[PDB]
Amino acid sequence: KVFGRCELAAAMKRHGLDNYRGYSLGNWVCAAKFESNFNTQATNRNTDGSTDYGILQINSRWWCNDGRTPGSRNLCNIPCSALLSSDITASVNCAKKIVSDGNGMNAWVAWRNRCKGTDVQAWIRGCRL
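Request: output the structure for the sequence above.
Response:
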């Protein structure tokens, strides 16, 4: 599924990401934009042989099982394909765990290089929320 900007904002808010560990909703929308372009089906291979899945590009090195990332973990206890669903529940629940794990949103390199320190509020401008 490719979400609309404000559609994603709303789904993300419904699922409790607005100010989750203090990250305002704009931060999440900004991260999703630059990670997947709001496409739930996005997949990208990492240099280490792991792969990133779904709207927030969650990694098989630590967070999910894709059956081909040796010496990895599955800390969200899910198959990585659940992260590609049109329903973002598993992505968001896994994201909550990632963002809680010590490094906050810095765990997302796109957030850190393209959202952190910026006017992220712009990402949720015009949206009925």
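The first strand starts at residue 43 and ends at 45.
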